[PDB]
Amino acid sequence: SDEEEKVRFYLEQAEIHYRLGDPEAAERAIYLAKMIAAENSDPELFEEIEEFEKELLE
Secondary structure, eight states, X not given: OHHHHHHHHHHHHHHHHHHTTOHXXXXXXXXXXXXXXXXXXXXXXXXXXXHHHHHHHO
């Protein structure tokens, strides 16, 4: 799925941005990932992105 591929890309960006001390850049990527999941009517993926984001912040 193109949606899943684009979300994976943005989550990868979020992980390494957060690892390197740039949480705002990480949250810019998470925003785009959530928007793709929301646009595609994918609540499960949207929820997975939130759990991903929560694991990063904690």
